[model samples]
Target chain A: FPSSTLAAVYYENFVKPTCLHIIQNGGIQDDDGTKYENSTIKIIIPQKLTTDVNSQFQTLKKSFQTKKLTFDYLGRPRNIDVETLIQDGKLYVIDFPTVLSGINYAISNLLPNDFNSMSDDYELILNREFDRFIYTLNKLALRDGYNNLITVINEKDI
Target chain B: PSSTLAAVYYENFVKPTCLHIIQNGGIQDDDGTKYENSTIKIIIPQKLTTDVNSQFQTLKKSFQTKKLTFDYLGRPRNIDVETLIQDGKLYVIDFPTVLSGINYAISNLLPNDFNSMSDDYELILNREFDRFIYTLNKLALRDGYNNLITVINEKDI
Candidate 1:
């Protein structure tokens, strides 16, 4: 029974590397170019600065981070668009957001079926990890009685 | 760390109890008479119904066919009790003991009729072992004889 519960846990903990992938990507970007550019525009062209310095002041103070970073081209080109560098698009981000969103066609410019096999493979791997748990649970619940009885007897006589 | 440990020793919490019964020959009482081991000499107190009855029939049939022992004409007579008794005692089996009265609880309580007997098989195994004890005791009382002075269940296993 403990092993059965641990089987589920074993599958759960199998993706430690992937989980680290997610955790490593978590943080904020205090150095956004839009905020930086807005500050630059205010300093050079004071005409853009209006009486509502409260909003401008607020923007200058605000700090943020990109959702995930991997050096890819998506909403904007990295060299051309400063906001893209600040928040989104990295080449190695792997387009999971798009693939995960069922909009891989928009990013990869290919049909969903193009990666259908890959998705199935990934899901099957996950289910394999999960079905191990199911098999272990049944073995424990159904067969463990005789096994336990044997263990009890063996400890005394054997 | 102890809480996170993979395994730990725990105490056996179930209280030890015995299934006290009176059988013939295996044990002797205030009155002496040798009988078969574990035989309920008082009478076959528990009616041998269900599988027991069917099993008796099957054995009788098999003996008729096999002619384990035969008369002069090679005609099989009474069924060989030894074959069935050997079958019963040959291996460790999950017999309905007083301890397993818990097995029948669910089936006994099921809300359907067809399932009642099915349920009772378990219920009787689990919760009603004590009841079986009571029934045997009641029979002893009816016969104006109590076997408490003699019980022969060695339970060697």
Candidate 2:
């Protein structure tokens, strides 16, 4: 799967559950849990960082089967309506499209100038970005009122 | 002097050079532009200090006094706060701040056209790089004093 595709999958699966678990356990995962009310979350997916996309898609397919949810690829990009999905209380799958050059350029600017060089420091930056991504997703889940449903899935090691 | 001095030096003097080294795979010996562009106009400190480790220990103790618990994401035991300052150096890389700042910087710079156009991506890339540099400075200052000096600044990117 592309990096963004994998990220979307991970977000829907592992990240969503992990965050919900933390919130239900005691809301201690975030110090200011009450502050997330009415907050809006905007995510930026880094397209250049993607590798092993096909394998990731297969894994995601398996996950859908395990959870007994429908899965399909439209041969194109689409947005995941997270708020609506949570409102309808259903599991959904979505994929990120091959990003535009300008978008890639934008995400690249936020990273080190030589991030494409793939140095350890570059990897560190990427890891930090991923952590931030998951953390934000968790916070968003809290804000949207999709609480203990995330705990319905087993805790993932991610 | 307050530890902030080391941070100022790190940002204005050390960081660009380290970045240059990474880009060029070595030093450039006489990069005047690199030196001139740095915000610090002070003489570069070439004196090596053996007190870095103990100083770090003192800083950690100060954190305790301030009632600040160092909460690492999942690796609290890895930091062994008691032994972080050992030998001739200190390891006080604040991963959480480093990550959070980078994340915040990127998110904060997203263009309104983000995810919908190529120009949006390009614009965001430039903004994020600036943010990265800015956040790196902030994170370095947030951590206490320890100077990692090398003659790399004398070289160019």
> Which has the greatest TM-score?
2
Q: What TM-score does model 2 achieve against the real structure?
A: 0.25
What TM-score quantifies how close candidate 1 is to the native fold?
Answer: 0.15
lDDT of each residue in B1-157, candidate 2, tens digit only: 1222223224432444334333334321122222212121111111111124222223334211111122132322111111122343322222112222223222322222223343433344334334434444454455421133222110121
lDDT per residue, candidate 1, B52-95, as tens digits? 43222243333211112222224322211111223332111112
Deviation (Å) of A135 in candidate 2: 0.9
lDDT of 1 at B39: 26
lDDT of 1 at A122: 35
| lDDT string, candidate 1, A1-158, tens digits | 12233332221221111223223334212334222211100001111111224323225323422333222122321211111123233211111110011111111111111221243443344234334444653354244232211110110122
The segments of candidate 1 whose C-alpha lies over 4 angstroms from its true place after superposition are A1-158, B1-125, B148-157
Model 2 lDDT per residue over A48-152, tens place? 322334223334323321121112222332222222111132333222222222223223332333322334444454445445544544554566575433321
What lDDT does candidate 2 reach at residue A54? 28
User: What stretches of model 2 exceed 4 Å from their correct place?
Assistant: A1-55, A58-90, A94-118, A148-158, B1-126, B129-157
